[PDB]
């Protein structure tokens, strides 16, 4: 191919706090419209914002996990625009003087090579509410207004639709491991806006940028990107110039579309919120969060390979789905046969749970039961043939391996 795709992403990550960013109302999914709501988060006259400490703590933790420089002073700024889901006529975020800057994420590519995607910034900001359209009216639920968000912006370091997805998957897994956010697109906990340009191969200049908004799954960002890259290459080699715009993606058609409205963006009239003093983050607090950092996926990966002698295929599975690794390690604790346990976990249990449509957190086979079953196979109490029969019913019932061995004869 003659060309090269240049891709940057803008990710909004919802923080797993109990409380909103600037008031004490609950953050929770699927409440009754306008119940978790407030003079503050409702943009009522006279109402003042108060910074959530855990929101701050989580955003520092996320910054570090993304290898960013955390800035000891940062400033909340007002971002102005008029829209029914934005109560105050402005969004409180950060601008100049964000929390974190100059970070990176490492991608592990299929071909086995590792690549870096830079994090340009991470800043703290509050969410807007949600609109529902019904007839000639819009219905506004402000339950979500003021929910804490980390806005994460990438440098245009991504080169491939697959890389874009892999980035998004790693970002999600880091957030989950760090414990800062559940980060599932399904529940609106992670949003992603895509920016993409093309470029003659090996060029250092930047091509004209198209923005694709409201792509709702990691798979859809790959699909959107797959098509858009094709679209732009067509335009350029047909002798045309690619035009700078925002576009939408239809999951049903797998295509990107320009917008009917030629509506240009308006000046945000940014300035430090005068209801708030600068966010001052002590070095001592960064140190404390750094020292007490949960274990991160790249670390866990090398640890399992060592501590348990798993293959890179095995550890990858256990690390890419954290709760599988957690299950494994709680099982290996009850019976110190790691090789046998991964086998029966990957080759047997996982597939059986998938079929019944049940997550590993909620499986009838507890780590004790798998460790126990693998014990009977190792000690030659039962055969593999019999072991595969009992695991199926373990999943079916919830009874211990020893329970059903007795109930049916050894």
């Amino acid at each position: 191919e003659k060309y090269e795709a240049v891709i940057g992403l803008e990710i909004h990550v919802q923080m797993d706090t109990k409380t909103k960013m600037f008031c004490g109302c609950k953050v929770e999914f699927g409440a009754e419209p306008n119940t978790n709501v407030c003079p503050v988060c409702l943009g009522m006259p006279g109402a003042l914002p108060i910074v959530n400490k855990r929101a701050v703590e989580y955003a520092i933790r996320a910054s570090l996990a993304l290898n960013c420089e955390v800035h000891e002073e940062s400033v909340f700024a007002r971002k102005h625009y008029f829209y029914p889901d934005l109560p105050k006529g402005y969004q409180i975020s950060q601008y100049e003087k964000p929390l974190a800057t100059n970070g990176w994420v490492e991608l592990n590519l299929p071909n086995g090579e590792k690549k870096k995607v830079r994090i340009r910034r991470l800043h703290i900001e509050e969410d807007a509410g949600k609109n529902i359209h019904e007839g000639d009216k819009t219905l506004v639920d402000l339950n979500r207004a003021g929910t804490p968000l980390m806005e994460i912006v990438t440098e245009p370091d991504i080169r491939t639709p697959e890389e874009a997805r892999l980035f998004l998957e790693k970002l999600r897994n880091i957030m989950r491991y760090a414990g800062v956010s559940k980060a599932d697109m399904e529940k609106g906990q992670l949003r992603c806006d895509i920016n993409v340009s093309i470029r003659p191969k090996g060029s250092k200049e930047f091509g004209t940028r198209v923005e694709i908004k409201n792509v709702n799954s990691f798979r859809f960002v790959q699909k959107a990107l797959e098509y858009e890259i094709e679209r732009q290459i067509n335009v350029v080699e047909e002798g045309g110039e690619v035009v700078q715009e925002t576009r939408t993606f239809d999951p049903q058609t797998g295509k990107t579309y320009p917008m009917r409205t030629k509506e240009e963006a308006e000046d945000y009239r940014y300035f430090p919120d005068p209801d708030l003093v600068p966010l001052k983050v002590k070095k001592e607090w960064i140190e404390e969060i750094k020292k007490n950092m949960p274990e991160l996926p790249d670390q866990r990966f090398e640890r399992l390979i060592k501590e348990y002698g798993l293959s890179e295929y095995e550890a990858g599975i256990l690390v890419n789905h954290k709760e599988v690794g957690d299950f494994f390690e709680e099982a290996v604790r009850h019976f110190k046969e790691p090789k046998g346990i991964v086998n029966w976990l990957i080759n047997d249990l996982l597939g059986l749970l998938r079929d019944k449509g049940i997550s590993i957190e909620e499986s009838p086979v507890k780590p004790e039961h798998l460790a126990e079953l693998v014990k009977l196979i190792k000690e030659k109490v039962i055969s593999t043939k019999i072991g595969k029969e009992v695991i199926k019913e373990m999943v079916e019932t919830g009874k211990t391996p020893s329970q059903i061995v007795e109930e049916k004869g050894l």
């Binding site: 003079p39 409702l42 943009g43 009522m44 006259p45 006279g46 109402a47 003042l48 914002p49 108060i50 910074v51 007002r78 102005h80 008029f82 029914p84 109560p87 105050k88 006529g89 402005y90 819009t138 506004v140 402000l142 000046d267 945000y268 009239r269 940014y270 300035f271 919120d273 005068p274 209801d275 708030l276 003093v277």
Partner: protein, 478 residues
């Protein structure tokens, strides 16, 4: 005559059952009915409701037990309209109480009404009330000042003894001056702005009007102090001001800014001020010239900062969650833009346009950011002058109360009312206006600016001045 009595006189009477809360309210209610048709201090009189609230008021040892108090109608009082004297907020029923109203209620006070103001507290005369002008009780052809016009006026006629206003660039002091009453704006951060409809967040402060320094010192003590609902409220203990006003500190010093000599003053104001200072000199105050090399820049600075914050803070009045909404519109855009053009008054609309300009990229650096820097230069003038002196004095106003329509022609002529008042808001300093003379039938205010957190001294000098000059005895409208 009861409404003619101070809070000290009223408290002794209430504590010993000689009078009840209901009678107090009834007294001021009458005086209200005597005066209101001429004055027009209130948007929403709540004497009726206060009468009923008085019946259940029983614990006499509460610091403001039976005391009626007027409140500016940009401070939220739960269950009653808070209009900010705007079409966009008439019929807005407050869903919660400002922190100060909570604190007054807890102290036994009785909210007796919502007071008239310039719309959204922008103006110096109250003429910009979207409903009607409040008039100066000492000459009803004259303005009471602004924006807290009605709070000053009602304290002046004694339709209430004590009153809450707010001060963004002189909105308590100026009205205090014009209406011949004591009015203080405390240090920025001393009183919570929770429930205060925000104009300029970095400049706004609730404050107090009264006729006796003790009345003012007590109401201020009650409403002041840290609020968790306000990030800008200071975690600083509130001084026992009621016990502190009556004390006398020896060898205090007063600064007269040299740069203020260049300010155009009406001869009557100049004369009244000179005499205030001479008389203070006699009582043993040392009088010194100070420099504030940047003060002259206060006005330009304020009229960049204030409009800017105002355009941001008024972004929320939109026809979506509360208040006024235009009747005819084809779009959300029209709904927005029509609601606002129709709901906002002219001065408000003027500062919104100016504000969204000053914050616009391309102009932000030379406008708002620049102004916030000059603002530090102006604050620093004060901190350095406070190394040599204890308070800074000047007239509160360059002129005597002016006539209706006099400063509506060019908007700028209204702004120039604020030239002596805005520097204290910029520096975040407390400042008091006390009545110093009566000239051609009209009140004249003397202003004292204090150091951060030094409301005590401002109040002390106010107490000493009233003993020499008993301005609390001058009652307008018979």
């Amino acid at each position: 005559m009861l409404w003619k009595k101070s809070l000290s006189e009223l408290r002794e009477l209430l504590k010993r059952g000689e009078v009840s809360p209901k009678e107090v309210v009834e007294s001021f209610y009458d005086r209200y009915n005597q005066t209101e048709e001429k004055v027009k201090a209130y948007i929403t009189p709540l004497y009726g409701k206060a009468l009923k609230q008085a019946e259940s008021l029983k614990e006499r040892e509460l610091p403001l037990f039976g005391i009626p108090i007027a409140v500016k109608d940009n401070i939220l009082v739960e269950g009653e309209k808070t209009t900010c004297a705007s079409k966009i907020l008439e019929n807005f029923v407050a869903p919660y109480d400002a922190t100060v109203i909570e604190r007054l209620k807890k102290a036994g006070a009785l909210i007796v009404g919502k007071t008239n103001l310039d719309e959204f507290a922008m103006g110096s005369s109250t003429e910009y009330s979207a409903f009607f002008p409040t008039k100066n009780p000492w000459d009803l052809e004259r303005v009471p000042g602004g924006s807290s016009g009605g709070s000053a006026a009602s304290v002046a006629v004694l339709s209430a003894p004590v009153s809450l206003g707010s001060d963004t660039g002189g909105s308590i002091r100026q009205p205090a001056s014009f209406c011949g009453v004591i009015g203080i704006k405390p240090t920025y951060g001393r009183v919570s702005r929770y429930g205060l409809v925000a104009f300029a967040s970095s400049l706004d402060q609730i404050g107090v009007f009264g006729r006796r320094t003790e009345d003012v010192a007590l109401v201020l003590e009650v409403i002041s102090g840290w609020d968790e609902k306000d990030s800008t409220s200071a975690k600083v203990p509130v001084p026992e001001w009621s016990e502190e006003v009556k004390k006398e500190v020896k060898g205090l010093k007063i600064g007269l800014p040299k740069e203020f000599f260049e300010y155009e003053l009406q001869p009557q104001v100049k004369e009244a001020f000179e005499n205030f200072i001479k008389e203070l000199e006699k009582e043993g105050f040392e009088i010194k010239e100070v420099s504030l090399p940047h003060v002259k820049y206060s006005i330009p600075t304020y009229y960049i900062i204030a409009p800017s914050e105002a355009s941001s803070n008024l972004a929320r009045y939109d026809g979506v969650r509360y208040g006024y909404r235009a009747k005819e519109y084809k779009d959300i855009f029209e709904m927005y833009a029509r609601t606002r053009d129709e709901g906002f008054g002219p001065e408000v609309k003027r500062r919104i346009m100016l504000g969204t300009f000053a914050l616009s990229a391309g102009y932000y650096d030379a406008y708002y950011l620049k102004a916030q820097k000059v603002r530090r230069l102006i604050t620093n003038d004060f901190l350095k002058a406070f190394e040599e002196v204890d308070v800074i004095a000047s007239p509160t106003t360059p002129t005597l109360p002016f006539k209706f329509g006099e400063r509506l022609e060019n908007p700028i002529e209204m702004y120039l009312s604020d030239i002596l008042t805005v520097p204290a808001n910029l520096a975040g300093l407390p400042a008091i206006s006390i009545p110093i003379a009566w000239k051609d039938g009209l009140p004249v205010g003397g202003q004292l600016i204090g150091k951060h957190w030094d409301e005590t001294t401002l109040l002390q000098i106010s107490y000493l001045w009233e003993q020499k000059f008993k301005h609390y005895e001058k009652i307008p409208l018979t």
